């Protein structure tokens, strides 16, 4: 067996919430979440929530993880798709996901470039490792049912594991999306903090945070560059800039239907007609990054 | 602000004054892209081709990182203020090698690996100075003595003269295989010549000596096998037969051929169509197979 390190091997997993939620586009749905868990200490390092299963959540949650913690020397990514249980998450959404169109690229290809070795099973034969996911469901994504779904605040929207659950009945009962997200962030934070962890590392004494704080300090990581991060963002189809240095984006799809116009001095006087926008849905209402049709970074266009 | 070996690399293209009979028979003047370590002045890699295209950059870059690793703070310079690198930074038609290639963009590849590109010759914000040297002998231009002016290429040497059609050189043209061989030797001689009168060398050491000395200090990371394959050219999907083998109609700027590759793993998988990542140079030996969606499958050898 090869020595394992904090951040050295992370396991990806999804989770369907047993809580009805009124999403940003008025739809009442059962939110789906993708987590990135540190295999060695079990701490949850990042996640992204959306109306359904889609690569964007994997892509952007990966970005949060590497941005916050850095890239280890021997980085290992696991997305156990044995039965094909990840086939839904790995399918690209329809370009009009947010009304405005996106460029068909592939995050899987981006992870490899960054230095991540991908695995589509539960073991890492080459290292002799094999428990990507923990034994006790409590330490895996299933353990998050008690901190989020069961959370008091979500008591009215909770549905339980009823496969055939009528959204129609939950119209007036749905919890506010912004509230759910807040609850989610707190749920996760508590999972990572609970003491009395029945694991080997913790030895029924420490919390996942305790062992991660300890082990992570022994690790050597590099922090991604400015560009490495932006490339992990989504590429919007070239929008034609006007002479005044502004452009519009009809934000629809799964997001709050809006019509944002971004402006940035440089854009104007600079010799540019069309620009390629690189964004993150969660910041779309605030900032976006502009690039020429050839790829050169033009500027950081703010909203108006 | 002390610069380290491998920290700042400068790329520059060179147009040869020697007529060569390429693999596709065409007698042309070969273009080459060089990567040079700004600190020590040592040439780290190059790629030769019929014209000027982004492929040579993408592949020469892969050779450099595969050999020396990726340092912590990596800077890459391609001065295009005078319009110089204009043609190099353009791709060829997808049928440049006969079969079709996907329209990727290597510029985006360099960034995802941690490189910081600059389109000028000075690295803004650091007291390093400029990429291109003063004494032109220490640059790409000093390769004329060791390559173009090589005795072995005397018949095809056109010397400096923009106006010079293949005309006289229909049969005077030196064969590609010999050129490339002479190229590799020239570059190695450039790097080995001692008494280099630079600050670093002090009219005593050679570019090689100083690089060995300085590079020993640089902390780098070797790229993974996947990072390396992702730098290779993406071919359009082909139909893998049930026998676990497929065809690649090589041509265009390369000698025509109908190569057949094979690998058992292809039968065991339910793969009908496979994506091929190749290196023009290794097409006659190996190719890398990837699932239509992006999952590595295996290395198919050439039959």
Give a description of the structure.
It is classed as transposase. Keywords: polynucleotidyl transferase, DNA binding, integrase, transposase. The assembly is dimeric. The entry is titled "bacteriophage MU transposase core domain with 2 monomers PER asymmetric unit". Chains A, B: bacteriophage MU transposase. Two copies of one chain form a homodimer. With about 300 residues, chain A is α+β, with helices and mostly antiparallel strands. Chain A folds into two domains: about 1-230, 2-Layer Sandwich (Nucleotidyltransferase, domain 5); about 235-304, Transposase, Mu, C-terminal (SH3 type barrels, Roll), CATH 2.30.30.130. Helices cover about 20% and strands about 25% of the residues of chain A. Chain A is built from six helices and 17 strands. In chain A, strands 11, 12, 13, 14, 15, 16 and 17 form a seven-stranded antiparallel beta sheet that branches. In chain A, a hairpin with a 6-residue loop joins strand 13 (about 245-250) and strand 14 (about 260-265). Chain A is globular. The N and C termini of chain A lie far apart (about 55 Å).
Find the CATH superfamily of the largest domain in chain A: Ribonuclease H-like superfamily/Ribonuclease H
Number of separate helices of chain A? 6
CATH domain topology of the largest domain in chain A: Nucleotidyltransferase, domain 5
Q: Give the class-level CATH name of the largest domain in chain A.
A: Alpha Beta
PDB class: transposase
Keywords: polynucleotidyl transferase, DNA binding, endonuclease, transposase
Assembly: dimeric
Entry title: bacteriophage MU transposase core domain with 2 monomers PER asymmetric unit
């Amino acid at each position: 067996v090869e020595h394992l390190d904090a951040m050295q091997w992370i396991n990806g997993d999804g989770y369907l919430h047993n809580v009805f939620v009124r999403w940003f586009n008025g739809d009442v749905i059962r939110p789906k979440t993708w987590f990135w868990q540190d295999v060695k200490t079990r701490k949850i390092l990042g996640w992204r929530c959306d109306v359904s299963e889609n690569i964007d959540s994997i892509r952007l949650s990966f970005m949060d993880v590497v941005t916050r913690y850095g890239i280890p020397e021997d980085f290992h990514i696991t997305i156990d798709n044995t039965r094909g249980a990840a086939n839904k998450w790995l399918t690209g959404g329809a370009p009009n996901r947010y009304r405005f169109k996106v460029k068909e690229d592939d995050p899987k290809g981006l992870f490899l470039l960054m230095g991540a070795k991908m695995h589509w099973t539960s073991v890492v034969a080459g290292k002799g490792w094999g428990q990507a996911k923990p034994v006790e469901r409590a330490f895996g994504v299933g353990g998050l049912e008690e901190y989020v779904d069961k959370h008091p605040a979500l008591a009215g929207a909770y549905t339980g594991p009823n496969p055939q659950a009528k959204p129609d009945n939950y119209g007036d009962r749905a919890v506010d999306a912004e509230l759910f997200l807040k609850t989610l962030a707190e749920g996760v934070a508590m999972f990572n903090a609970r003491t009395g962890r029945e694991t080997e590392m913790c030895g029924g004494k420490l919390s996942f945070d305790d062992v991660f704080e300890r082990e992570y300090a022994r690790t050597i990581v590099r922090k991604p560059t400015e560009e490495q991060k932006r490339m992990l963002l989504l590429p919007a189809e070239a929008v034609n800039v006007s002479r005044k240095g502004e452009f519009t984006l009809k934000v629809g799809g799964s997001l709050k239907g809006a019509k944002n116009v971004y402006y940035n001095m440089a854009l104007m006087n600079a010799g540019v007609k069309k620009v390629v926008v690189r964004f993150d849905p969660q910041q779309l209402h605030s900032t976006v990054y502009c690039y020429t049709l050839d790829g050169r970074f033009i500027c950081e266009a703010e909203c108006l």
